[PDB]
Symmetry: C3
Subunit: 222 residues, 3 copies
C-alpha cells in the first residue's frame, strides 16, 4: 500500500519530468522555456523525494507514528516554484509575488512544526499554518486574480481556472493532514500515502499541464 | 521573567504585523507596497518565532545552559529583509546589496556556531562573527551611505539617520551575547530574554517605522 | 596530513578572499565589482568552512568512517556562486541560468544523501547525483556555450576555456568520492582531505582568476 504508492509517485513524477524536460529543450520562445523549466524542476524535486521515501529515507517514528518529515523539504522547494507558475503567467507585481512566496514558506515551516510536535501542541501550529494558507487564499482570489485579468483582458477565464484549480487542490492537503493520525486518526498511513501521492501528481503534473495550456490561451489571444 | 517577555514579544510583533499588514493592503504605490510588505514579513517571522520559544520550542540546554538556538532561524530569515529595507530605500547597487546580505548570512551562521559550541571554542567563532559585523559596519557607513546620498541629494540626513539607527541597534546584539552566559555570564537567561525581546522590537517594529517615514521624506522631496 | 591540508585550505582561501576583496573595493565598473564580489564570497565561504573542519567541527563518524558532512554546506552555498560566474560572464538566459543552479542543488543534495547513507544504498544516490552532474555537463557544453559565444562573437575561445576548465575540475569531485572510503576505499581520509583541498583551491581561487581574466578578454574586445 504505502510502498506501492511511493513507487507510483516516483514513476509518475519521473514521467512528468521527462515531458517537461523535452518541452524545455524544444521550447518555443523564452516564456515557454521558463514555464517548461519550472514545471520540470517541480517534478524532479518530487521524483527524488518519492525516491527517498520509497527507499525508507526521511521517515522516522514521531509521537508513535511513522512520519515522512522529508515531505516538507519537497514542498518547501517545489511549492514556491508552483506559485511562480501563477505569478509568471500572471505577470504579478514584485510585492504581491513576494507575499505569496513568503506566506507559502510560513505555512510550510509552521506545518512542519505541527507535523513533528505531539498533540495538542500540534493543533496550535496547525491553526497557525491554516491561517497562513487562508491568507494565500485571499491573495490568489482577490489581488492576484484581479491584477492578472487587467493585464490579460480577453483571457479572464484562464486566470479564474488557474486560481480555482490551485485552490481546490491545495485545500485538500490540510484536510488529509487533520484526518490523518496527525489529527483525528480517521485513516492510517497507507491511505495517507495514497492521498498525498495523488494530490502531488494533480498539483505538480496536473497543474503543470494546466499552466502550459494557460500560456497557450494567453498567447493565442495575441 | 523569561516567559513574560516571550509573550510580550509575541503580542508586539503580532501588533506590528497587523500595522504593516494594513499599510500593505492600502498601499499608495508599489514602492510603499514593497516597504509595507517587507516589514510585515519581518514582524510575522519574529511573531511566529517568539510563539515557538514561548511554547518551549527551539530551546535546548547546551553547554549546561538553556539556549534558544531557534532565534538564529528567525534572524537568518528576517535580518536580510531588514537590510533590503536599507538597500530598497537607498536604491543600492546589486554588488553592494549582495555584499550586505552575504556578509549578514556569514555573521549569523558563524554566530550560530559560536552559540552552540562550548568555551573557549565559541570565543573564536564570536570573533569571526564580529569581524563579519564590522565589515557590514563599514559597508553601511561608507559605500552604502555615500551611494545613497548621491542618488538622494536633498535628503542626506535621512540616510544618515537610517544607517546610524541600524548600526546602534545591531551593535547591542553582540554585546548582549558576550555579556550573557555565552560569554562572561554577567546576567542570566531572564535578563537575556528581555534584552533580545526589546532589541527585536526596536530593530523590527521600531526600524520598520523609521523606514516608512524615510520613504516619506525621500518622496516629499519630489 | 588531514590537519595540515585543512589549515592550508584556510590560509589559501583566506589569501584568496583578500585578493578578491581589494579588487572589489577598487573595482573598475559595476561588472568588475560583481565579479570580484562573487569570487570573494566563494572563498570566504570556503575559508570559514575549512576553519570549522580544521577545528574539528562538522565531522562525524558515519558508517564507521570520519565524514566531513559540513563540506556539503560549503558547496551548496559556494557552488551556485561559481555557476553565477559563468552565467554572468556569459549573459545567460534566465531559464538556462535557473536550470544550472537547480541542477547543481539537485546534485549536491543527492550527493549529501549518498555521503551520509551506507553501502550499497549510497551507490544509488551516487548514480542519481552523477546523472545530475552529467546534465550540467550538457547544459554547459551545449546550450550555455553556444548562447554565450553568439553574444560574444570575437571572444569564443574564452568561453570554450571557461566551460572546459570548470568541467575538468568539477569532474574530479565524483572521482575522488567513489575512490574514497565512500566507494572502493582506494585511499584513506588524509589523501581525501588533500584532494578536496587542492580541488577547492583550483575551482575557487583558480577559477576565480580565470573568470577575471575572461572579463578582461571580453572587454578588451570592445
Ligand atoms: C507539491 C506539493 C504541494 C502542492 C504541497 C502543498 C502543501 C500544502 C498546501 C500544505 C498544507 C498544510 C496546511 C495548510 C495545514 C498544516 C499541514 C499542511 C502542511 C499539510
Ligand atoms: C531582528 C533581529 C536582528 C536585527 C538580529 C540581529 C543579530 C545580530 C546583529 C547578531 C549579532 C551577533 C554578533 C555580531 C556576534 C555573535 C553573536 C551574535 C550572533 C548575537
Ligand atoms: C568549491 C566546491 C566545489 C566546486 C564542489 C563541487 C562538488 C561537486 C562537483 C560534487 C560532485 C559529486 C558528485 C557529482 C557525485 C556525488 C558525490 C559528489 C557530491 C562529490
Ligand atoms: C524561489 C526563489 C525566487 C524568489 C524571488 C522571486 C522574485 C520574483 O520577482 C517577480 O517575478 C514575477 C514573475 O515570477 C514578475 O512578474 C515580477 O516582475 C518580478 O518582480
Ligand atoms: C533574500 C532574497 C533576496 C536576495 C537577492 C536580493 C537581490 C537585490 O537586487 C538589488 O535590489 C536592490 C533593492 O533591494 C536594487 O536597488 C538593485 O537594483 C537590485 O539589483
Ligand atoms: C543564488 C541566488 C540567486 C539565484 C537566482 C539567480 C537569478 C539569475 O538571473 C539571471 O542572471 C544572469 C546572470 O547571473 C543574467 O544574465 C540573466 O539576465 C538573469 O535573468
Amino acid at each position: 500500500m504505502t510502498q506501492a504508492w511511493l513507487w507510483i509517485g516516483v514513476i509518475s513524477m519521473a514521467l512528468g519530468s521527462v515531458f517537461f524536460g523535452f518541452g524545455a529543450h524544444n521550447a518555443k520562445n523564452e516564456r515557454w522555456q521558463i514555464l517548461y523549466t519550472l514545471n520540470f524542476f517541480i517534478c524532479l524535486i518530487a521524483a527524488g523525494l518519492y525516491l527517498a521515501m520509497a527507499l525508507g529515507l526521511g521517515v522516522n517514528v514521531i509521537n508513535g507514528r511513522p512520519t515522512y518529515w522529508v515531505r516538507f523539504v519537497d514542498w518547501f522547494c517545489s511549492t514556491p516554484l508552483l506559485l511562480l507558475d501563477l505569478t509568471f503567467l500572471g505577470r504579478t507585481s514584485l510585492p504581491l509575488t513576494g507575499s505569496l512566496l513568503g506566506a507559502n514558506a510560513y505555512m510550510l515551516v509552521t506545518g512542519f512544526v505541527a507535523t513533528v510536535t505531539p498533540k495538542p501542541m500540534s493543533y496550535i501550529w496547525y491553526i497557525v499554518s491554516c491561517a497562513a494558507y487562508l491568507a494565500i487564499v485571499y491573495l490568489l482570489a482577490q489581488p492576484y486574480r484581479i491584477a492578472a485579468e487587467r493585464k490579460h483582458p480577453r483571457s479572464k477565464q484562464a486566470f479564474r481556472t488557474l486560481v480555482t484549480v490551485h485552490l481546490v487542490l491545495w485545500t485538500l492537503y490540510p484536510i488529509v493532514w487533520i484526518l490523518s493520525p496527525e489529527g483525528f486518526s480517521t485513516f492510517t498511513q497507507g491511505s495517507e500515502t495514497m492521498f498525498y501521492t495523488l494530490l502531488d501528481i494533480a498539483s505538480k503534473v496536473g497543474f503543470g499541464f494546466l499552466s502550459l495550456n494557460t500560456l497557450h490561451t494567453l498567447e493565442q489571444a495575441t
